[PDB]
Design a protein around this ligand. Structure first.
Ligand SMILES: [Cl-]
Length: 209
C-alpha cells in the first residue's frame, strides 16, 4: 500500500522527466514487486500491461482482474521472452532487487520492439563490487553511483541500445539508496554522446532524490 504509492510516485517522475508517452501502448513491468508501476501505466492510458510476478508477496487481485493486465507467474526477469509475454512491447520498466541490470538487460531487450523505450531503475547497491556498499547498505560514494549508471549504459549499448536520458528517482529506496532511471532506445536521433551521458549522469547525481 505505502509501497504502491512509492512505486507510482517514482515512475511518474521518470515518465515526466523523459516525456515518454504511454497512451495506447503495450507495456512490460519486469519485476512487479508492487502494483505501483502498473497502476501508473493504466492511469496514463496503456492499452496493456504485462506484470511479471516475483513469486513472493501478492499483487492485488483487483489489479489481476483488470482486463488490461496480464500477471505472468513463475518466471524471473532473465527468463522473459516475447512468447512468454504475448509478443514484443513498446515500453519496458524494471525495478528489480538483488540483481545487476547487466545480467537482465538481454532478456529485457529481447522483449522490446524496435521503436520501444526501455527504462530500468539503476540501483547502485546491486551494481557495485564487494566492499563498496557502505554502512546501512547504502552506496555513499557519488562516483560509484555514477559508475554504476555508466556500466549499465555500456552494457545496453553493447546490445544496440543507446542512452537518451538519466533522472534520479524522486524517492530513495527504503534503506536510503539513491537510484537512477536510465532511458534507453535503439531507434533514436537524440542519443547522448559519451560526454553527453557523463553530463546527464553528473547532474542526476548532484540533484539527488
Ligand atoms: Cl535502499
Amino acid at each position: 500500500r505505502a509501497w504502491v504509492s512509492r512505486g507510482a510516485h517514482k515512475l511518474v517522475g521518470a515518465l515526466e522527466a523523459f516525456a515518454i508517452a504511454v497512451a495506447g501502448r503495450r507495456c512490460l513491468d519486469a519485476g512487479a514487486s508492487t502494483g505501483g508501476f502498473t497502476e501508473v501505466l493504466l492511469d496514463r492510458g496503456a492499452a496493456h500491461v504485462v506484470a511479471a510476478d516475483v513469486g513472493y508477496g501478492q499483487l492485488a487481485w483487483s489489479l489481476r482482474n483488470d482486463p488490461r493486465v496480464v500477471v505472468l507467474e513463475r518466471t524471473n526477469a532473465r527468463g522473459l521472452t516475447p512468447e512468454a509475454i504475448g509478443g514484443r512491447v513498446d515500453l519496458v520498466v524494471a525495478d528489480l532487487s538483488f540483481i545487476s541490470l547487466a545480467t537482465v538487460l538481454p532478456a529485457l531487450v529481447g522483449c522490446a520492439s524496435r521503436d520501444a523505450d526501455i527504462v530500468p531503475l539503476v540501483k547502485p547497491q546491486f551494481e557495485v563490487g564487494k566492499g563498496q556498499v557502505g554502512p546501512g547498505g547504502v552506496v555513499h560514494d557519488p562516483q560509484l553511483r555514477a559508475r554504476s549508471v555508466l556500466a549499465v549504459a555500456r552494457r545496453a549499448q553493447e546490445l544496440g541500445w543507446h542512452s537518451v536520458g538519466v533522472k534520479a528517482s524522486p524517492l530513495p529506496g527504503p534503506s536510503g539508496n539513491v537510484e537512477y532511471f536510465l532511458w534507453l532506445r535503439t531507434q533514436t536521433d537524440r542519443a547522448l554522446s559519451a560526454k553527453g551521458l557523463e553530463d546527464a549522469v553528473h547532474r542526476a547525481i548532484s540533484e539527488g532524490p
